[PDB]
Amino acid sequence: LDQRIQTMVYREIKKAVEENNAESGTAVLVDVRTGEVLAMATAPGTDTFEPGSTVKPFVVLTALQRGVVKRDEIIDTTSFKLSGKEIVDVAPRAQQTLDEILMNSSNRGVSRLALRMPPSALMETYQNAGLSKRWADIERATVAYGYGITATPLQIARAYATLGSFGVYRPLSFEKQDPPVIGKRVFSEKITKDIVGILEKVAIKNKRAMVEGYRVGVKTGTARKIENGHYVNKYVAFTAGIAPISDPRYALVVLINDPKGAVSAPVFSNIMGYALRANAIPQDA
């Protein structure tokens, strides 16, 4: 825990909450190299939510890792239905690359990849990243766009730390810690490095989360809050990401409850900076 950073996170969240007149916000900064929680801060008047788009990079990872898609493959992102429910896209296209699916955050892109794979495939991938009898065709899809499932910011932070280490799952430490650290390798180095690459492109196309000096990789989404074991028709904005792309040091999750839409992105950019610039992390942009 960096108190210089923790005090800065606690201020940045307050601004974001009161500025967006949100019900509450949360931010978590995990050190990629050690798994120590550098900053954890919440603006009272860590609750669970739907991971949503945050899981999508892990679906592309899994599909490449399973060899059920070729890296340069064009996916059919034209409308379709599973168990009678239509898969909807925010930014529909006809044909998408894997790069475009994370970039366009297409539910269809990821839904198709899931149905190229046993349901076990994504379930192993979530368990590995720490997000922890025959499946209906819609259930096989929703999980792939992180609908119908639960998560916490620390869970997303760790997960995103697992990208940063290029596939090495290091458990979270509250206690101060120094490299090197024992950690189970759970994802291909080459393919995780590559997804972090695609995350960069997401960060670029959505300018609001980028950081002056540094290269920053991010996923940004909306999903239902999960109160007392159920989904309530109340929204959460999150951006999750790692930086600096070239040698990741920080996994950061930002969550704001009930903003009153790319509103968590600029809160990431500010906290990712004051953290990188405050610990003298060589620029790479």
* DSSP SS3 for 32: coil
User: Distance between CA atoms of 203 and 206, rounded to whole angstroms?
Assistant: 5
All residues at 6 or more sequence positions from 17 whose CB lies less than 8 Å from its CB, including other chains: 24, 25, 43, 256
Query: What domains can be seen in the chain, in order of their start residue?
Result: 1-285 (3.40.710.10)
Catalytic residue numbers, as ranges: 53
Phi-psi category of residue 102: left, alpha or beta, with phi > 0 → left and psi -120 to 50 → alpha:
alpha
What tokens does 267 get?
């809160």
Give the residue from 142, 133, 26, 131 showing the smallest Cα distance to 82: 142
Resolution given for this structure, in angstroms: 2.4
All residues at 6 or more sequence positions from 261 whose CB lies less than 8 Å from its CB, including other chains: 222, 237
Residue 6 class from Cβ within 10 Å (0-12 exposed, 13-18 middle, 19+ buried)?
A: middle
Query: Computed from CA positions of residues 128, 248, 172, 141, in that sequence, does the dihedral angle turn out positive or negative?
Result: negative
Strand ranges (E), 104-229? 168-169, 184-185, 217-227
